């Protein structure tokens, strides 16, 4: 008792934690105008049936993949011994689903979520026959967003007009670069640079973290911010490459994908990027595509 | 690149939970304020992604005192024999509890750390609450999907049923029944069918959020809405021991209304089978 003592649509592509995720994270900031959740698991799973029962008001949960037609944004968030064997079983779930997606939802932004994400994105490039500025993965863009929180936050360090960046290849090791001028001693920057990125390795990568940088992604595209991204993109021209890869790269973003690489400082920068363009190369020339 | 081919709620604790319970809450637009406080090692920067999304109306802190005045208060918090798992529970709850009661007075105390019933139980001896304003989780999402079961994956015609006692895998449902008369045989069927269904899904931190902010979404609109939650069963089912089972409630803004009532054997003897261990389990902590 009482005694003491434009209708911007959006569809997320797949139920589990990380589908979830970013569900619940652009729900909360009110990103999308409509969301589709594609619940693709075996239907006695009831995967979602938790999300249904909650009933949000712009939610709509399916297995049909039309029902993603005419979305504005497409997030891949599904996943599946050896390496080879492990990344085929994830491209060959792409295979029966990118093509289908991409042709309901043809002026789409695609956004990666799924690992090997580099390989993913080309992956999911190759089977929807979009253009290369609207391909996108997730590249290095919640590791970005981390770092300039550590430098500014943690770290409170002065930082005038530059930004810094993690580039290349997703993993732990990690490339950073700047991109800005007052002139800063070299042996500081340096400093600053290898203490801020310690502080990022050591930290892992939830579900819940990367819905948060998804729908953030998902915010600059849909309201056309034109907000810089590290995102996996096209690399061919870049560093030397002159092979179809994506690796995580600064991109403005908006209602049509990336606009624009921007530029930064040029070395072990391009020798870390061209050694990840080999081998992601390599990968995807034994892969059955 | 062209190329083809006021309402203001806490959650305590900043672990996968809390966020979910956060996330959740604000999807819904539930809360006017949010304070989230992450009682980690501040080292780890446990919610340092939150802090980099930036939602409208929610403000992490370390700082007990950010949470004065809220509505609801959520406990998230967690952590070997049994026992001394549990005493290090208590003792997190310990230090915790009666602060939060001291800034948040007025509020309800909704407890979703783990064994339910116990945590709820000593939520409500280190807050000097009254009973209706401290309740747990209890058995509520099994509820909500169980009605779900019934009414949509098994199309039955019926909402009136409800997973009732000591949370775990093996569970207890009642009905509160109406005019209509159904064949025993046919509801008994009924209830085991979508109780099988029921037991065979797991509950994620996703899924507890969910459930989480609904509850708080009826306590702080007052709607009256019936939740089965940990409540203070003394005087129910001849459990005379002061334990928290799971119960179906009215919620509102004072928190419990009224438990109503719900059904005639094994049930009792279940419940009284779980208030014994409960209470057995509480007599040697230390609280
Ligand atoms: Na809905
Ligand atoms: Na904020």
């Known amino acids: 008792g009482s005694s003491k003592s434009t209708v911007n649509k959006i569809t997320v592509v797949g139920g589990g934690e990380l589908g979830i995720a970013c569900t ?4 909360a900031k009110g990103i999308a105008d409509r969301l589709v959740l594609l619940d693709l698991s075996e239907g006695t799973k009831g995967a979602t049936m938790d999300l249904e029962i909650f009933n949000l008001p712009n939610v709509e949960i399916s297995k049909d993949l039309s029902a993603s037609a005419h979305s504005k944004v497409v997030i891949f968030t599904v996943n599946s011994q050896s390496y080879l064997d492990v990344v085929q079983s994830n491209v060959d779930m792409f295979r029966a689903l990118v093509p289908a997606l991409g042709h309901y939802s043809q ?49 409170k360090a002065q ?28 042996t500081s920057q340096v400093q600053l640079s290898n203490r801020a990125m310690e502080l990022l390795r050591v930290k892992g990568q939830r579900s819940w ?36 890869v994506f690796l995580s790269l600064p991109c403005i973003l908006g209602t049509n994908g990336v606009s ?30």
């Not at 619940?24 to 729900?27: D, G, P």
């Not at 930082?159 to 070299?186: A, P």
């Open 24 to 27: 619940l994270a652009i729900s």
């Open 107 to 155: 002026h789409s932004v695609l956004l990666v979520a799924s690992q090997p994400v580099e390989i993913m994105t080309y992956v999911t490039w190759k089977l929807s026959t979009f253009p290369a500025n609207r391909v996108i993965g997730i590249g290095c863009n919640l590791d970005s967003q981390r770092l300039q929180y550590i430098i500014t936050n943690v770290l």
């Open 159 to 186: 930082t005038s007009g530059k930004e810094v960046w993690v580039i290349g290849e997703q993993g732990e090791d990690k490339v950073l670069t700047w991109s800005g001028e007052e002139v800063v001693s070299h």
């Open 209 to 244: 973290s990367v819905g948060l940088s998804v729908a953030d992604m998902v915010d600059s595209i849909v309201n056309n911010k034109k907000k810089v991204h590290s995102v996996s993109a096209l690399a061919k021209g870049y560093y030397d490459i002159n092979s179809e």
């Open 260 to 289: 624009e690489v921007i530029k930064t400082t040029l070395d072990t920068v391009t020798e870390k990027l061209q050694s990840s363009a080999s081998s992601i190369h390599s990968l995807q020339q034994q892969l059955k595509l």
